Amino acid sequence: LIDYSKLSKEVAYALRHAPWEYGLELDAEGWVDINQLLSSLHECEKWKKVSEHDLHVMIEKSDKKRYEISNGKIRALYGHSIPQRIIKEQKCPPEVLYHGTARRFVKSIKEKGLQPQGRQYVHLSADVETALQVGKRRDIKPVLLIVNALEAWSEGIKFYLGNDKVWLADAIPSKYIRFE
Ligand SMILES: *SCCNC(=O)CCNC(=O)[C@H](O)C(C)(C)COP(=O)(O)OP(=O)(O)OC[C@H]1O[C@@H](n2cnc3c(N)ncnc32)[C@H](O)[C@@H]1OP(=O)(O)O
Ligand SMILES: Nc1ncnc2c1ncn2[C@@H]1O[C@H](COP(=O)(O)OP(=O)(O)OC[C@H]2O[C@H](OP(=O)(O)O)[C@H](O)[C@@H]2O)[C@@H](O)[C@H]1O
């Protein structure tokens, strides 16, 4: 049987972080031919059994909509770190978005605002529980930040489509972030 969770982590690395290591090139919106991905995964002993059907199943069973398959191509919807900016659709955000973080980063976010750091975009959540889960990746007592996203947008900060639970933004100045 396939560990679809571990397969999902491998696909994340290929489609967000190091496509070159797989001999892949992503298009401007992040897509690659799914047969080229499968061929690359089959260089790895653990993934030689993985079929195109398995990639659909991995997506269906996942707790998050990380990837999409369309007309024989696959992309990650968010998370990228590669030098070439992934073109995402600009969108007007809801009034409020959230961002869960680690206690150890709060001072720096107060001073500088939210920054993309190792990714191309700041990632934000649509609801509190989702944001706390983001923060739990780094801190058992994560900090919830509340972003006045529509105010930021009206003052020129760009936001972009990730998926229904993950919104993307350029750097967000501190004045739009509530820490309490
Ligand atoms: S046999 C040859 C295998 N391939 C290679 O050797 C090439 C380089 N391999 C690697 O770098 C690692 O083996 C990878 C593929 C990254 C897997 O290592 P980890 O077990 O440590 O994975 P992480 O926990 O660090 O997470 C990796 C990214 O995957 C996201 N993710 C996708 N799907 C899930 C699921 N179901 N559950 C948890 N996390 C998942 C992770 O959030 C993470 O995302 P980042 O963008 O890296 O933050
Ligand atoms: N000025 C500043 N100074 C200091 N620290 C600052 C800072 N600005 C921001 N930070 C913090 O710098 C960390 C960046 O960390 P990340 O790149 O991993 O971003 P993120 O945590 O949002 O996570 C992305 C997605 O990854 C996962 O998705 P998957 O499961 O992989 O699909 C999640 O669920 C997400 O959707 C975060 O703590 C920021 O708060």
Residue numbers in the entry: 3 to 182
The authors write:
Tpt1 is a fascinating enzyme that transfers an internal RNA 2′-monophosphate (2′-PO4) to NAD+ to form a 2′-OH RNA and ADP-ribose-1″,2″-cyclic phosphate. The Tpt1 mechanism comprises two chemical steps in which: (i) the RNA 2′-PO4 reacts with NAD+ to expel nicotinamide and form a 2′-phospho-ADP-ribosylated RNA intermediate; and (ii) transesterification of the ADP-ribose 2′′-OH to the RNA 2′-PO4 displaces the RNA 2′-OH and generates ADP-ribose-1″,2″-cyclic phosphate. We succeeded in growing crystals of Tpt1 from the mesothermophilic bacterium Clostridium thermocellum (Cth) using recombinant CthTpt1 produced in E. coli. Hexagonal CthTpt1 crystals were in space group P6122 and diffracted X-rays to 1.4 Å resolution. The refined Tpt1 structure (Rwork/Rfree 16.16/18.57) comprised a continuous polypeptide from Leu3 to Glu182, consisting of nine β strands, six α helices, and four 310 helices, organized into two distinct lobes spanning amino acids 1–85 and 86–182, respectively.
Here we close this gap by attaining a 1.4 Å crystal structure of Tpt1, providentially captured in a complex with ADP-ribose-1″-phosphate in the NAD+ site (generated during protein production in E. coli) and the pAp moiety of coenzyme A in the RNA site. This structure, which mimics the step 2 product complex of the Tpt1 reaction, yields keen insights into how Tpt1 recognizes a 2′-PO4 RNA splice junction. The 1.4 Å electron density map revealed two non-protein ligands bound to Tpt1 that were acquired during production of the recombinant protein in E. coli. The molecule associated with the C-terminal lobe was unambiguously modeled as ADP-ribose-1″-phosphate based on the electron density and the anomalous difference peaks overlying the three phosphorus atoms. The molecule associated with the N-terminal lobe was convincingly modeled as coenzyme A (CoA) based on: (i) the density of the terminal ppAp moiety in the Tpt1 active site and the anomalous difference peaks overlying the phosphorus atoms of the terminal pAp moiety, (ii) the electron density flanking ppAp corresponding to the pantetheine moiety of CoA, and (iii) covalent attachment of the terminal CoA sulfur to Tpt1 via a disulfide bond to Cys46. The pAp terminus of CoA is a mimetic of the dephosphorylated RNA product of the canonical Tpt1 reaction pathway. We envision that: (i) an endogenous substrate dissociated from Tpt1 after transfer of its phosphate to NAD+ to form ADP-ribose-1″,2″-cyclic phosphate; (ii) the RNA product site was then fortuitously occupied by the pAp moiety of CoA, present in the E. coli cytosol at 1.3 mM concentration; and (iii) CoA remained bound to Tpt1 during purification because it was covalently tethered to Cys46.
